[PDB]
Amino acid sequence: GGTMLKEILEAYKEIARTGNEREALLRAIDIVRDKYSEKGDEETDTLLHRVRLDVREGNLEHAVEDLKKLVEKRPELKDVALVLILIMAEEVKKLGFPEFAEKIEELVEKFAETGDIKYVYAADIVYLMALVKKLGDEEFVKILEKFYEKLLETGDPVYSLIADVILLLAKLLKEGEISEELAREVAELLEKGDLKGVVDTVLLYYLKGEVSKEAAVAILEKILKVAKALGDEELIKHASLAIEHVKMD
Numbered sequence: 001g002g003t004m005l006k007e008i009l010e011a012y013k014e015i016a017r018t019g020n021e022r023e024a025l026l027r028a029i030d031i032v033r034d035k036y037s038e039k040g041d042e043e044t045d046t047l048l049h050r051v052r053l054d055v056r057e058g059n060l061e062h063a064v065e066d067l068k069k070l071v072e073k074r075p076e077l078k079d080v081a082l083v084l085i086l087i088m089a090e091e092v093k094k095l096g097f098p099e100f101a102e103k104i105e106e107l108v109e110k111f112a113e114t115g116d117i118k119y120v121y122a123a124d125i126v127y128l129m130a131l132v133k134k135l136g137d138e139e140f141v142k143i144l145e146k147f148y149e150k151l152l153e154t155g156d157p158v159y160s161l162i163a164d165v166i167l168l169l170a171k172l173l174k175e176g177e178i179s180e181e182l183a184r185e186v187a188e189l190l191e192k193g194d195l196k197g198v199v200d201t202v203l204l205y206y207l208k209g210e211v212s213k214e215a216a217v218a219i220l221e222k223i224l225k226v227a228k229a230l231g232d233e234e235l236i237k238h239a240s241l242a243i244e245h246v247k248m249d
């Protein structure tokens, strides 16, 4: 929390002064992995092995994915989160977006001289913007920006989950799954305040015969994940009933 985290960023900056932009990441991953190999944690050392291999090969997206999983299961880890944000910032610059890279860099700077996890989550949303900005959508970036602004003034770890749902909608809107109208309706429902009208809209579109049994369950499980970290038991039951109806019946 402000210590043992600023040294990692300082070393990253020294090894990035050259301009390699890839050996600094590997050195930071090494620094993190040494602190967790000296312990008796064999679940994190192997994960950092895989992450370093992915970064060295060039497949940083898999690294950000599995580091995201790690930081979600265990948010106590703060150097792992710092290296995750560094890899996110490095990957964003490869996608072709220089202003999102600047936003993530300032997020790293504010995370180093603090220790609050509320910035890490914010970085995720910025990262997601890049992804959403690459799939083609432009009207989905604004909702993500609104969530990003609302995270930096509330610090709720439940606003990145809605961004994950929006990313899922953007992904399905491209491949050939659920069409534009449902995407816009669900985005509008997730935007304002509704996580219960989303369930009803998905069910209504499923019964009317406009959504497959796989995309509907994907959206419903994402909504259940959002509703399991909000302290709601009148929406966990609703999501469970909807998943039961769509899945089997």
Ligand SMILES: [Zn+2]
Pocket (backbone or CB within 6 Å): 050, 062, 066
């Ligand atoms: Zn993996």
Ligand SMILES: [Zn+2]
Pocket (backbone or CB within 6 Å): 245, 249
């Ligand atoms: Zn039925």
